[PDB]
Amino acid sequence: RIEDGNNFGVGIQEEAIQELARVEESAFNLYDAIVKYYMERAKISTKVLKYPNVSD
Amino acid sequence: RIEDGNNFGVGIQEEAIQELARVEESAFNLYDAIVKYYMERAKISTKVLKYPNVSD
Amino acid sequence: RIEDGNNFGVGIQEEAIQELARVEESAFNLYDAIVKYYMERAKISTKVLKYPNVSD
Amino acid sequence: QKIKEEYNKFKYDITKQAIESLRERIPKRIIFFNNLVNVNSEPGSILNVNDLDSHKQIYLELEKIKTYASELIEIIGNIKLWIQLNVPRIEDGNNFGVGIQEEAIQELARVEESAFNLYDAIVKYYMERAKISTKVLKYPNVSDYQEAVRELDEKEWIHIKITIVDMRNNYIMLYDLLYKNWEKVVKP
Amino acid sequence: QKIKEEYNKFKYDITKQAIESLRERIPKRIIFFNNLVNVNSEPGSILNVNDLDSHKQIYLELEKIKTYASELIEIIGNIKLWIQLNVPRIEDGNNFGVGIQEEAIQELARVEESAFNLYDAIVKYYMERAKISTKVLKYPNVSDYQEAVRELDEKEWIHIKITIVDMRNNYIMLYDLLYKNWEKVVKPKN
Amino acid sequence: MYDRHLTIFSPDGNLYQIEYAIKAVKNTNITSVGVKGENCAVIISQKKMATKLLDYNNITNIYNITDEIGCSMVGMPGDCLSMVYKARSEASEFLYSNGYNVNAETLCRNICDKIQVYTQHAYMRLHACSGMIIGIDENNKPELFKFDPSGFCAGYRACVIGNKEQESISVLERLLEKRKKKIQQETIDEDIRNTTILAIEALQTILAFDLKASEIEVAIVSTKNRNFTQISEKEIDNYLTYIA
Amino acid sequence: TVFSPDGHLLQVEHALEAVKKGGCAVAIKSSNFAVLAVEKKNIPKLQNPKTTEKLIKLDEHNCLAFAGLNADARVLVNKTRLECQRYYLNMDEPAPVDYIAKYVAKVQQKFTHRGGVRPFGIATLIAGFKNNKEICIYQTEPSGIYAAWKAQAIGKNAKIVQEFLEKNYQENMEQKDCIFLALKAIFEVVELSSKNVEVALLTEKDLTFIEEQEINSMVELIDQERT
Amino acid sequence: SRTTTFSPEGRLYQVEYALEAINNASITIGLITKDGVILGADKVFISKLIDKANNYEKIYKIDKHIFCGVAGLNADANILINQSRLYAQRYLYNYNEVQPVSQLVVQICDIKQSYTQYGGLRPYGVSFLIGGYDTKDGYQLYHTDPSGNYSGWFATAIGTNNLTASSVLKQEWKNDMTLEEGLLLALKTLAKSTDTEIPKSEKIELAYLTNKDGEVYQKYLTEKEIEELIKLYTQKYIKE
Amino acid sequence: LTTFSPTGKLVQIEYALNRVSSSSPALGIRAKNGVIIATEKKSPNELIEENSIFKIQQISEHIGIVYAGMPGDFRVLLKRARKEAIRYSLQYGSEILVKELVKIIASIVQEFTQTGGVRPFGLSLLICGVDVYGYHLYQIDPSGCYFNWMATCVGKDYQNNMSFLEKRYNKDIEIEDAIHTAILTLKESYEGVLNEKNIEIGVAYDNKPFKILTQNEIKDYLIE
């Protein structure tokens, strides 16, 4: 319960909450990042078929 | 009414509204996010219809 | 374990992590920059074939 | 133990280079750039467009810019690293000098980053000029695209020269800062 | 020995140029810019369109802006450098005078950045007007494009004059600021 | 930071509340120069408001601590009067506790000692004053002692206190050069006419003032006088015409 | 020591957390005696005595067993024995436990109320005698409050050991039965070795200790009880 | 920050820093033998130009039978010693008998307690291995703290490198240690703690009591230590 | 008020040591027939005199003292040094020993460090003189501790001046030989070549009263 004083432990708790939420957000963003990989790679691959001599 | 001092309980009220607004804000953004689902899949699907052999 | 007072040494530990995370993020960023080199060069090189007299 | 011998040799060669740069390399470049853009010039005689004739003239001026940019990064990079190696062990209190050191590293990092950003910006000039020129062939009667080419060269000509002034100003500010604060930079 | 002389000579050349600019070059320009935008003018008589007939007329006006911007950067740049070169060794406490110096450098960089941005802003004028004009050529009966051209020209015409006002007020504020704070700019610790 | 208090050292090892107190003296635009010759020493005031209808005969910067040891406290108008009483009640405390009259060097070293105890303790603030204690001792040798808000029983042969101390050393040096190298062995205790002119010429060289008649009041503590007599106005205006 | 917006204290609430980081001590009352038991841990091969930290005497009929700051206990005890004898000189009677407990609790209460004085970080439990032949095990606190318990424990994890005493505390136990009650509380102290507990049997106005060989015959019964 | 304030865990602010301030000073040692309690400490030097062994600042004298090996802030050391001799002598004036060391540390540690509790003054960053002989319980060796919790010992190594030298005494200290066997042991633990195999003798200094019915309390010189260190060269202890 | 630091030291005391490293340099050397103490009377102009500004002072008939810090703190620690040299000479017969004087002045500097509301002493003393057991040359660090130095320097640039003494000072050196190495270490670190009657040197001079060398006497040694 929120009380005045003796809440050093909630600060301890906050450090745990901060790190736990950070790791989850990082792992959650992998699902969006993998979709981004295929979208850009497919687009560039289409360009190779359209422009077969630009070697880059 | 806002007063100087002895407003520790008001601090609880302010902290609670912030947390309450957070959950409300979180649920409210889902309606726009679902439109984004259809929007992203539809754009990519158009490319699949135009370019059926780029497998990515 | 996180404790109150006599924690000058954890600050030293954190300071080391700050420099380590900075160098790691920079090196991690080298991989995306390499993709950017080839991607930008391929688009510009394509433009030279389309517009062969603009010397710039 | 073999590396320990090799390591001490490395710290000595840097220290030599740092003193050499402050007594000779940095002042010499101050005078060099000053001879190109003299402070006694009347207003408008530096940042003008009177001497402006792909733009073959612009290619050679940027090449000179890249030389000036190269010499700055090479000199400052070792000086910056040297100051970092001179930061004392972290302690609580009686570390006012490390704050001076940090301010110096911050300023040193600012100028190197400033010179580093010149390389991407010069590419933007060629990219922008080429893009506008393509538009003139597709839309030959919109006269403003041709005017845009003219102003771009005039902007770049000014931008080149303000950079040269910025070269001068950066060299002296680095030299002036380390000289005045030399005692706290070496023994914190 | 030549470098020892040349460096002090450089500091001498700056100090002369800085004082010369503040005592002569800046006051002379105050009267110059005032004759272009007189303070006694009634409101709206400056930022108007009464004298408005590519727009060949705006080109000559744009050229003067670039001249004013160049001369401002050159004059202010040496003043800024002079105060920085006059900043004493960093010390803890009794550095109230560096704050006066720092305040001047912060304001000097602000005015310099604003004037520097005019070169980019003029390119935007030609770029935006050219882009809009292409659409007029492609779609000659959609009439809203011609009003858009007009308003763009109207935007640039006022901004040119606002730039002149920005020249005038910054020049006077600089002379007034240095005059009032002259003792702390030269000797911050006596 | 490290400037809001007085008993704290800065990180570079330098006291700042003392340093700010000396700037208080160099801000009240009051300059008082004093010279010491052979068995004759004078002090010149400036008679200006420490910043209409004010009686200009009362505003001054010269106070006598005893009957033979005078001084000239400049600085804040509230701290100078208190330092005179902390000296008047000190030299008067010496004659009762020691019988013989106090010396100029013992008084200045006792004033600087009382000032130093307020530096270590954060109880009170520093007295923003600076005076030139003048007087002669038993050996018939005049002295001079200038003390800033810090501890300083330095003592000079000719000194200048005020807002001009940053560069007023060369002017007092050239004027003492014109008397040492041009010494006159025929001195018949006429130094009250020679040393006083050297002092008024010093203040007139520092401050370019034409007619400083009513705004200059001096004091002579030479032998055969021994009373710290404030020179009248007629003698001041007479001395001001000998510069021709 | 300044009040908080909710009404609680700060140093008095902080110093009360300092006694939690201390060795466990437990005193158990009986009919005509009160066996005390304090558990302390030292470093082997060095530290020659038991240092006689706890089970301090105060008079001929008193026994104090502190818990908390081992350095701050000597000042409270030397300021207690000074009043344990000042009373004897001013009332010609040995100091009863009703006055000592009211005094020790007054010293801590006088420090949290003063200006610029760190409160005592200890909490002792006094087990003495009253005016008649009655035993009343008192127990102070760093806040100043006190209460005459019948079984109490303080120090590291003073809640589960206090909970065990509530489970099997009868009215008037015997001599060995009352020692086994306090000696059954070694579940809080690691390894239950005899080199950690130090009991003391205060009885019939004659304070005495218990030898190391007697606690071995009693701690060995816990091995057959821990299965 | 302030010294008369607590922390939410219960420990103190200034005492935890003061207990760490003595961890930077040079190491000391203590050893109770069958003949007398001996001490020893590494004389930390700043240059090779201080002085000889006629004046050293690590082992002081309290009375004719009590002496402490100080360690920590040398500034607060002399103020406690000037307050320790006044307590070991006031007992002689108030009771006409020597003061036992068990009753001297209580008078010393109670003055440290008074500075860490009320007054708002910085604590004493000094800890010393005070040891002496008495007719009540023989040779004793106590170890103070910047807080006040004194404790009896047999061997302690406060100062810097405590855990390294204290681990040596745990495995190389018998009960009937004589004076010679204790001297070479104290000479070894004072060397291994400083990460050096040989002592330069222009370093570490020792002292001992050796009750001969009159408390001789003989100290050591730079020459008398040379012949003792040579005996450490002929022998070869298991721990360097 | 001075308070402890989390790394285990005093912050306010460490700033006091930064004050003695920025003042006029001093130099104390102990010989086999007395001790010597030098200083650097940096003349600011020709207005001050030589009879008042002193970096060398006396405590008794055989006690010398120099400073290395605040000029205003000269006359305060000297006032209590003389009183403790007088109070000891009242309760006891002979003069005050240097070890009994340093252990008394150090108890005054240390007391002005722990007590709240006061500022630590911004100076480093060098008490030297003849003792009945020989010759001593102590140094009072602003923290309150002291060292029984044999040859040292305490003012500005006390690092290179300390190394210039370790390579130029044997155990047996006479007074006339120590004076030549005293002026040599001053000029090796003092700026400019104006070393001419700007050094005040005191000397114990083999069981004789403290005699401050005059201006016409220091030139006799400076030319060698």
Count the Cβ atoms, other than its own, within 10 Å of residue I34.
22
Contact indicator for I137, I166 with CB cutoff of 8 Å? no
Q: What residues are paired with F129 via a beta bridge?
A: F75
Which of chain H's residues have a Cβ under 8 Å away from the Cβ of A6?
8
Our count of domains for chain F comes to: 1
**Rounded distance between C-alpha atoms, residue F222 and residue F29, angstroms:** 28
Domain that holds residue I6: 1-224
Neighbours of chain E (3+ CB pairs under 8 A): D, F
Query: How many CA atoms, within 13 angstroms, populate the side-chain half-sphere of residue D108?
Result: 22
**Rounded distance between C-alpha atoms, residue E178 and residue A29, angstroms:** 54
Neighbours of chain F (3+ CB pairs under 8 A): D, E, I
Considering only CB atoms, I110 lies closest to which of H17, H21, H78, namely: H78
Nearest Cα neighbor of E37 from E171, E170, E168 is E168
Domain that holds residue F134: 1-244
How far does H12 lie from chain C, in Å, by closest CA?
8
Supply the DSSP string of F3-51, one letter for each residue. SS-SS---TTS--SHHHHHHHHHTTS---EEEEE-SS-EEEE-------
- For helices E96-138 and D96-138, angle between their N-to-C axes, nearest 10 degrees: 20
**Rounded distance between C-alpha atoms, residue F176 and residue D78, angstroms:** 55
The two tokens of residue D33 are: 């750039």
> Chain B to chain G, count of Cβ pairs less than 8 Å apart?
5
Nearest-10 Cα torsion for C25, C27, C29, C33: 170
The two tokens of residue F131 are: 């005076």
- Assign residue F202 the CATH number of its domain: 3.60.20.10
The two tokens of residue D91 are: 């302690």
* Number of helical H runs and strand E runs in chain A: 1, 0
Is residue C49 within 8 angstroms of chain D, CB to CB? no
Q: How far is CA H90 from CA E46, H84, H94, H145, I134, in A?
A: 96, 10, 6, 23, 32
Count the Cβ atoms, other than its own, within 10 Å of residue E21.
20
H or E stretch including D57? helix D56-85
Mutate to test the interface with H, among G66, G69, G74, G118 (most CBs of H within 10 A): G118
Q: What is the resolution of this structure in A?
A: 3.9
Is residue F22 within 8 angstroms of chain E, CB to CB? no
Considering only CB atoms, D130 lies closest to which of C8, C15, C54, namely: C54
User: H220 phi and psi, to 5 degrees?
Assistant: -125, 150
* Number of helical H runs and strand E runs in chain B: 2, 0
Nearest Cα neighbor of F136 from F183, F62, F188, F66 is F66
Is residue C55 within 8 angstroms of chain D, CB to CB? yes
Nearest Cα neighbor of E177 from E108, E88, E94 is E108
Contact indicator for G199, G33 with CB cutoff of 8 Å? no
Touch test G–E: 3 Cβ pairs or more under 8 Å: no
- Residue at B38: amino acid letter: Y
Handedness of CA G189, G192, G196, G201 (dihedral sign): positive
Contact indicator for H27, H42 with CB cutoff of 8 Å? yes
Backbone dihedral region for residue G115 (phi beyond 0: left; psi -120 to 50: alpha; all else: beta): beta
In the three-class reduction of DSSP (H, G, I as helix; E, B as strand; rest coil), residue F177 is classed as helix
**Rounded distance between C-alpha atoms, residue D12 and residue D123, angstroms:** 39
* Chain centre distance of CA E137: 37
The two tokens of residue D140 are: 């030959």
Considering only CB atoms, A15 lies closest to which of C2, C39, C42, namely: C2
Q: How far is CA D186 from CA B38, D85, G24, in A?
A: 63, 10, 55
In the three-class reduction of DSSP (H, G, I as helix; E, B as strand; rest coil), residue A24 is classed as helix
Mutate to test the interface with E, among F6, F9, F10, F26 (most CBs of E within 10 A): F10
User: G64 phi and psi, to 5 degrees?
Assistant: -120, 135
Greatest pairwise CA separation for chain F in angstroms: 61
Experimental method: cryo-EM
The two tokens of residue G159 are: 């809640």
Count the Cβ atoms, other than its own, within 10 Å of residue F203.
25
Contact indicator for I68, I124 with CB cutoff of 8 Å? yes
Q: How far is CA G123 from CA D102, G120, H176, in A?
A: 50, 8, 40
Touch test C–D: 3 Cβ pairs or more under 8 Å: yes
Mutate to test the interface with B, among A10, A34, A46 (most CBs of B within 10 A): A46
Mutate to test the interface with F, among I42, I55, I67, I75 (most CBs of F within 10 A): I75
Touch test B–G: 3 Cβ pairs or more under 8 Å: yes
Q: How far is CA H55 from CA B24, H30, H59, H219, I146, in A?
A: 77, 20, 10, 11, 11
**Rounded distance between C-alpha atoms, residue H230 and residue H199, angstroms:** 10
The top-level CATH class assigned to H1-240 is: alpha beta
The two tokens of residue I162 are: 């300390």
Supply the DSSP string of I144-189, one letter for each residue. S-EE--SEEE-SSSTTHHHHHHHTS--SS--HHHHHHHHHHHHHTT
> Chain C to chain D, count of Cβ pairs less than 8 Å apart?
20
The two tokens of residue G106 are: 């007054």
Cβ neighbors of E81 (< 8 A, separation 6 or more) are: D169, D172, D173, E14
Query: Which runs of consecutive H residues, i.e. helices, occur in chain I?
Result: 11-17, 74-91, 98-109, 111-114, 160-166, 175-187, 215-222
**Rounded distance between C-alpha atoms, residue I166 and residue A16, angstroms:** 58
**Rounded distance between C-alpha atoms, residue E170 and residue E108, angstroms:** 10
**Rounded distance between C-alpha atoms, residue H210 and residue H182, angstroms:** 12
Count the Cβ atoms, other than its own, within 10 Å of residue F205.
14
Contact indicator for I36, I179 with CB cutoff of 8 Å? yes
How far does H9 lie from chain C, in Å, by closest CA?
7
Render the burial of I41-58: b for 16+ CB within 10 Å, e for the rest.
Answer: beeeeebbeeebbbbbbb
Considering only CB atoms, I150 lies closest to which of H50, H57, H82, namely: H50
Residues in chain C: 56
**Rounded distance between C-alpha atoms, residue E116 and residue D162, angstroms:** 9
Cβ neighbors of F202 (< 8 A, separation 6 or more) are: F33, F35, F44, F158, F160, F171, F172, F175
Q: How far is CA D88 from CA D18, D84, D95, in A?
A: 18, 9, 9
Render the burial of D70-107: b for 16+ CB within 10 Å, e for the rest.
Answer: eebbebbeebbebbeebeeeebebbbbbbebbeebbeb
Count the Cβ atoms, other than its own, within 10 Å of residue C30.
8
Q: What residues are paired with D155 via a beta bridge?
A: none
The two tokens of residue H188 are: 């070894």
H or E stretch including H26? none
Supply the DSSP string of G109-122, one letter for each residue. HHHHHSSSBPPP-B
F residues 76..135 contacting I (CB < 8 A): 105, 109, 112-113, 115-117, 119-123
- Assign residue I124 the CATH number of its domain: 3.60.20.10
Which of chain F's residues have a Cβ under 8 Å away from the Cβ of E98?
none
User: Tokens 């009750």 — which residue?
Assistant: H211
- For helices F104-120 and I74-91, angle between their N-to-C axes, nearest 10 degrees: 100
Query: How many CA atoms, within 13 angstroms, populate the side-chain half-sphere of residue E142?
Result: 12
Contact indicator for I136, I128 with CB cutoff of 8 Å? yes
If you ran DSSP here, which 8-state letter would residue D22 be given? I
How far does A20 lie from chain H, in Å, by closest CA?
25
Is residue A42 within 8 angstroms of chain B, CB to CB? yes
The two tokens of residue F146 are: 């200038």
Q: What residues are paired with F156 via a beta bridge?
A: I48
Nearest Cα neighbor of F23 from F158, F130, F156 is F130
Q: What residues are paired with H105 via a beta bridge?
A: none
User: Tokens 């009259």 — which residue?
Assistant: F101
Contact indicator for F34, F42 with CB cutoff of 8 Å? yes
Nearest Cα neighbor of I80 from F108, H86, F117, F6 is F117
The two tokens of residue A36 are: 């981004």
Which residue in chain F is spatially nearest to E189 when comparing CA positions? F23
**Rounded distance between C-alpha atoms, residue G69 and residue H135, angstroms:** 31
Is residue H16 within 8 angstroms of chain G, CB to CB? no
Neighbours of chain A (3+ CB pairs under 8 A): B, C, G, H
**Rounded distance between C-alpha atoms, residue G71 and residue H147, angstroms:** 7
Contact indicator for E178, E26 with CB cutoff of 8 Å? no
Which of chain B's residues have a Cβ under 8 Å away from the Cβ of G5?
5-8
Burial class (CB in 10 A: 0-12, 13-18, 19+), I177: middle
Considering only CB atoms, E93 lies closest to which of F1, F26, F166, namely: F1
Supply the DSSP string of F41-61, one letter for each residue. EEEE-----------TTT--S
Contact indicator for I187, I39 with CB cutoff of 8 Å? no
The two tokens of residue F128 are: 């923003």
H or E stretch including H151? strand H151-152
Supply the DSSP string of E45-82, one letter for each residue. SSS--TT----HHHHHHHHHHHHHHHHHHHHHHHHHHH
**Rounded distance between C-alpha atoms, residue H180 and residue C42, angstroms:** 86
Query: Which runs of consecutive H residues, i.e. helices, occur in chain F?
Result: 17-25, 79-98, 104-120, 169-180, 191-206, 233-240
- Delineate the domains of chain G, giving CATH numbers in brackets: 1-227 (3.60.20.10)
Q: Domain locations in chain D? A: 1-188
Contact indicator for D119, D69 with CB cutoff of 8 Å? yes
